[PDB]
Design a protein around this nucleic acid. Sequence first.
RNA 1: CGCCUCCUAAAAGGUAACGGAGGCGCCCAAAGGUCCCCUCAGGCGGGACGGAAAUCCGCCGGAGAGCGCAAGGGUAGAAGG
RNA 2: GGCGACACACGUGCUACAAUGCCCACUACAAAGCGAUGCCACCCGGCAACGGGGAGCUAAUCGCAAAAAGGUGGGCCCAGUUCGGAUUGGGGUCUGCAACCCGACCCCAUGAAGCCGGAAUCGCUAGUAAUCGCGGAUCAGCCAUGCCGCGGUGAAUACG
RNA 3: GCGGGGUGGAGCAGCCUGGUAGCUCGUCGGGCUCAUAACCCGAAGGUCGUCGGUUCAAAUCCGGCCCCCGCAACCA
Lengths: 83, 23, 116, 181, 69
Amino acid sequence: PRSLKKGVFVDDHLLEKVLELNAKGEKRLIKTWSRRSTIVPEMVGHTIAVYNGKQHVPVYITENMVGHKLGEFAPTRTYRGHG
Amino acid sequence: GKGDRRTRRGKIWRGTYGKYRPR
Amino acid sequence: ARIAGVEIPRNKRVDVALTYIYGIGKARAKEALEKTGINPATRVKDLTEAEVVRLREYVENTWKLEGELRAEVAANIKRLMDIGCYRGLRHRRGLPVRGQRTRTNARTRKGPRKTV
Amino acid sequence: PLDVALKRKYYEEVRPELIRRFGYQNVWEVPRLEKVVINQGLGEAKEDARILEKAAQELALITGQKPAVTRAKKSISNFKLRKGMPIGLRVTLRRDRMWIFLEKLLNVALPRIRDFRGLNPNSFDGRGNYNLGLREQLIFPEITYDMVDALRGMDIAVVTTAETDEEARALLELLGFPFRK
Amino acid sequence: MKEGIHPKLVPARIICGCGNVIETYSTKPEIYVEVCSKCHPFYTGQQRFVDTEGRVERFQRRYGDSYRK
RNA sequence: CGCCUCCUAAAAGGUAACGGAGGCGCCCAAAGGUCCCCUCAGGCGGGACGGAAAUCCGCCGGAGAGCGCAAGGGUAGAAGG
RNA sequence: GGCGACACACGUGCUACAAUGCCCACUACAAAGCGAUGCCACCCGGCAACGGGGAGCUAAUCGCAAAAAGGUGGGCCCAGUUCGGAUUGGGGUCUGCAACCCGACCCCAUGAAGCCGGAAUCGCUAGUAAUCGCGGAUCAGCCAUGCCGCGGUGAAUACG
RNA sequence: GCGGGGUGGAGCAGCCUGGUAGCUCGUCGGGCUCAUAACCCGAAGGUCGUCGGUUCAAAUCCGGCCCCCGCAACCA
Ligand SMILES: [Mg+2]
Ligand SMILES: [Mg+2]
Ligand SMILES: [Mg+2]
Ligand SMILES: [Mg+2]
Ligand SMILES: [Mg+2]
Ligand SMILES: [Mg+2]
Ligand SMILES: [Mg+2]
Ligand SMILES: [Mg+2]
Ligand SMILES: [Mg+2]
Ligand SMILES: [Mg+2]
Ligand SMILES: [Mg+2]
Ligand SMILES: [Mg+2]
Ligand SMILES: [Mg+2]
Ligand SMILES: [Mg+2]
Ligand SMILES: [Mg+2]
Ligand SMILES: [Mg+2]
Ligand SMILES: [Mg+2]
Ligand SMILES: [Mg+2]
Ligand SMILES: [Mg+2]
Ligand SMILES: [Mg+2]
Ligand SMILES: [Mg+2]
Ligand SMILES: [Mg+2]
Ligand SMILES: [Mg+2]
Ligand SMILES: [Mg+2]
Ligand SMILES: [Mg+2]
Ligand SMILES: [Mg+2]
Ligand SMILES: [Mg+2]
Ligand SMILES: [Mg+2]
Ligand SMILES: [Mg+2]
Ligand SMILES: [Mg+2]
Ligand SMILES: [Mg+2]
Ligand SMILES: [Mg+2]
Ligand SMILES: [Mg+2]
Ligand SMILES: [Mg+2]
Ligand SMILES: [Mg+2]
Ligand SMILES: [Mg+2]
Ligand SMILES: [Mg+2]
Ligand SMILES: [Mg+2]
Ligand SMILES: [Mg+2]
Ligand SMILES: [Mg+2]
Ligand SMILES: [Mg+2]
Ligand SMILES: [Mg+2]
Ligand SMILES: [Mg+2]
Ligand SMILES: [Mg+2]
Ligand SMILES: [Mg+2]
Ligand SMILES: [Mg+2]
Ligand SMILES: [Mg+2]
Ligand SMILES: [Mg+2]
Ligand SMILES: [Mg+2]
Ligand SMILES: [Mg+2]
Ligand SMILES: [Mg+2]
Ligand SMILES: [Mg+2]
Ligand SMILES: [Mg+2]
Ligand SMILES: [Zn+2]
């Protein structure tokens, strides 16, 4: 994945919105367009609506889903099976 | 075994190096 | 079921015989032979009980093997499947996980073809 | 009668500890081992193998006792089973052989179990007895890899003079039965 | 017991892989076993064998706290 | 169309109709004689492969099982194993 | 975000099913090209992908660069295997604002199908077929097993 | 009333002798052809009209019921 020599990647503009909610008293829904952004220990507890190209998926964030990206939890493809 | 990366021949095929084909 | 829960093939060289254990490849086999000071070229049918009890004790204590290793692989997937991540979806529909094409091939993840 | 490790342990450490933990007013009210009945439900020797004497010979090594045959009480289509067919073995270990078996089972066999995370606590009769199952017979020390042709497990029944599960749970753990919960 | 149909039980010595010797009775006087109660991880208290890991995930990153705040 | 079982049959026996319902025309060399042991179906719980049901353990269970085949009578204080 | 979907169906391919083989070590012989936020000698940290230094060269000077098959030796001993390298777990490297969808590479573990392929069907007549490595264009990187080139070793057979 | 049947989509075996569902056609996949038919190579699909019963087990033996075929329904 991303080289350990560099930093843990969050789009900062989103990381900003997270911290502001922790201080001022959390929490509300977060419209984001950062699927490329990493889930982070501060994001835990909120619910972030992640856009998949079409809609924003209401994603609750927990402890076990820290190291992943926001995009893994917002499916991009519609599929109900074949035939 | 031109496909097995854990061999001499395998890294030749990939054109890469490593423990199994060092430089 | 000598070491480590598997009874390694006799009449074969001790280095390869270890590869028949879950959790051990050729790599961890080259290791345990120096770290226990045993000749890699000798057969297991020619191992001293001293050489045996040492190789056994080391390998069961240095690495996670058989049922436990299978347990964590299962535990690792169980969570990925449960959190609802993409890696989990692919484990729940049995489809290829590592971003391969699914238009053709993919026969190892799915199973033999179901024609139509 | 032979003095054996697990037997002597019963009277010296296990016997008293129980009178403490439960407070019995009579010496016989205390839990005793009644009998250990080992059963190989087999049935793989129905039509195919009229020859299962290997398993009898195997059980004869394990328990120092020749098992008896169990036969089909009634005919059954689905199991390809006609009334009176020989489908299993059962040896009843009592007294010193009962101890000797449990002693080797507790100290040697149960450990040699693949991925042994402790006997199941919930396998208790309710009436104060215990039953457990093994999937291989290689678990026992007397059985080398050479003398085994094909795998076969068994059922083990341990009967207690105890009235309740709790009393039964105690007696066995004290004797050295490892439970997971 | 019935004579001639039963295996003879005699004093026995089951030798474990930790060197432990068990005084018992068996159909064979000498036996070598790879494990016993005195060295099996489930038995010996709670020997973490090889996996003293502590999960380790998911908070086990901390790689690092250098991101901006 | 002869034979066996139940009902009709009116609490002895018997009792008809092209009245209501089923069986027999075999079988077993043990499925016979005797002596000695043994006791079921089913229910709940427990037990590797083992399942509603294979074999094992426990508790309850007067007989509802079994007795070669129809039915009835009988029957574990055996006629059952 | 999609173009990378996936109950399936076809074409073109890659790597195989092994002993005329596979692996480890040591040792040879090409050609064509490319290369100034470009190729990077050598040096040191890491098993390694790489990372830090750092010499040279607008290149018949310097570098990519080792050619590989071959050769000397040792191992494997006919087994789904030291054949085969798919699939999956985990730890990492690199580019790039960013590798969830959706990159390549490295290391540990996992070690699938596959025992030479039904009906059918393609190519090649000599330095050819077969087999082995190497370079370039595009291009941050790369899903190239594609394409366009280049040499090594090097056949069988054509009655008609 | 008497005899005979109901089983892949179609038409027939299997039933009598209980365990073991078969043949032709059609159907789907792939070949050959420009394409098509034919032809070749593969594969799928019947819990046996039902409801009951005998048995260890029923397409198979037995009974009820539905449906279809054939014969009979005379002296009046
Ligand atoms: Mg290989
Ligand atoms: Mg292994
Ligand atoms: Mg890919
Ligand atoms: Mg895909
Ligand atoms: Mg006493
Ligand atoms: Mg219980
Ligand atoms: Mg009791
Ligand atoms: Mg054994
Ligand atoms: Mg007569
Ligand atoms: Mg009467
Ligand atoms: Mg009367
Ligand atoms: Mg009467
Ligand atoms: Mg009267
Ligand atoms: Mg009279
Ligand atoms: Mg008799
Ligand atoms: Mg009789
Ligand atoms: Mg009689
Ligand atoms: Mg019962
Ligand atoms: Mg039960
Ligand atoms: Mg079970
Ligand atoms: Mg049962
Ligand atoms: Mg009765
Ligand atoms: Mg009858
Ligand atoms: Mg896209
Ligand atoms: Mg496209
Ligand atoms: Mg290709
Ligand atoms: Mg090829
Ligand atoms: Mg295999
Ligand atoms: Mg195979
Ligand atoms: Mg292999
Ligand atoms: Mg991974
Ligand atoms: Mg990507
Ligand atoms: Mg072969
Ligand atoms: Mg070939
Ligand atoms: Mg082919
Ligand atoms: Mg020509
Ligand atoms: Mg080759
Ligand atoms: Mg190339
Ligand atoms: Mg280039
Ligand atoms: Mg590039
Ligand atoms: Mg009529
Ligand atoms: Mg029909
Ligand atoms: Mg007929
Ligand atoms: Mg027949
Ligand atoms: Mg067709
Ligand atoms: Mg045209
Ligand atoms: Mg055609
Ligand atoms: Mg019926
Ligand atoms: Mg019956
Ligand atoms: Mg029936
Ligand atoms: Mg049938
Ligand atoms: Mg009928
Ligand atoms: Mg007339
Ligand atoms: Zn020990």
